[PDB]
Amino acid sequence: GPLGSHLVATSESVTEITASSFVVSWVSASDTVSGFRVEYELSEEGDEPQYLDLPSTATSVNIPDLLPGRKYIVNVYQISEDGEQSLILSTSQTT
Structure with a gap:
């Protein structure tokens, strides 16, 4: 049982x-959420x-068809029963 390792x-x-x-x-930032919406775009190109x-x-999803060597901005929004969206998680990644 190595210590520190x-x-x-x-x-x-x-x-x-x-x-x-x-x-x-x-x-989930709310149990009243009717669903979730994930958004990912290139931080560089600024594509749509x-x-x-x-x-x-x-509470988790994999985003395929991404362009390697490009940075993306990912933001998760939860949808309420009224169709309202709220940012619960925002982070960027580099393929």
Whole structure:
């Protein structure tokens, strides 16, 4: 039982690459949410944003068809029963 040492990396749980994708997870900011909407766009090119919809029970999604070597801005919004969206998680990533 080595002390100060633990670096095992087991099996890198940060998988998503494939197609330069991203696997982003968040925490529901409300149980009244009717679903979730994920938005990802290039921070460089500034291309048009893409939107993905997930059920209120969804708390994680993989974004495929991403361009490797490009930086994306990802923002998660939860949809309320009234169709209202609220930013619960905002982060950027580099494929």
